[PDB]
Amino acid sequence: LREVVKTVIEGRITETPKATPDPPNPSGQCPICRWNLKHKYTYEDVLLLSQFIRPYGGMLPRRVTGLCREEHRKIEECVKMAHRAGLLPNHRPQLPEGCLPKDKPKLNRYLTRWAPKSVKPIYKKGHRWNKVGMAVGSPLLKDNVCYSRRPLKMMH
Amino acid sequence: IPDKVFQPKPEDHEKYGGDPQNPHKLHIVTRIRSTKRRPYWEKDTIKMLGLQKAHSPQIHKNIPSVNAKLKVVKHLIRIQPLKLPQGLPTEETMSSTCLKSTGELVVQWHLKPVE
């Protein structure tokens, strides 16, 4: 991790966080599998998500993280859900120069697959056999362990 | 359906707990469906076997003629092998007989909780 100080500029390699010793699952090629977290994390587990996210909420590159694409998509989706849910107060977006929040009320959301901005309203709900389905969750998280009698309903 | 279904294999014997030798003698058959809306041949066979009432136990011989009749109505019946753990009942013990759900006909009914 190199940081630039500034005309003459000076870059110093600074201390980088080290992975804790003794992984629970050694022989794991991917960091997520090394800790047996393949199917047991959710967007609510912000602590894990923050490690892979930029200070302002941007995604870190997969190559630097080194984790497999499957978890990368899962982690990216989880962060997006947390960000849209306002669950990352310390990773909020950087305001361009001096902007301020719109000050309009912010609706509380969670399990948001898509941005609320780009989702159109559903005027017609439909009849008995024409009911429209409401997407909840993401397909990337289908494999997550379920503790219910029946598999979770993606469409509400 | 292949004829192997009625030709048993050692794995099938273990699954159903049936010995390949000493084949069982008697069948237990109960009607589990209605004969309404079924073709006449199915209706005739059910009447011949006497399974007019559903959920009614019927004892049949495990002989080729009976086996052919049961095969025609296989889908409408449940087949279980009757077992005589204590052997055939005697005339004196004929009044103490009782048929268990397991398929075993005891020749003595003591009215005591097995627990």
Partner: peptide, 27 residues
């Protein structure tokens, strides 16, 4: 139209029961 979880299970049970019927007709 899709099928109720109840209907799928019921046929599976009956098919298995008929399979047991087959074996006892095999001896």
């Amino acid at each position: 139209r899709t099928v109720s979880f109840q209907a799928k299970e019921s046929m599976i049970r009956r098919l298995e029961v008929e399979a047991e019927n087959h074996y006892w007709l095999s001896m």
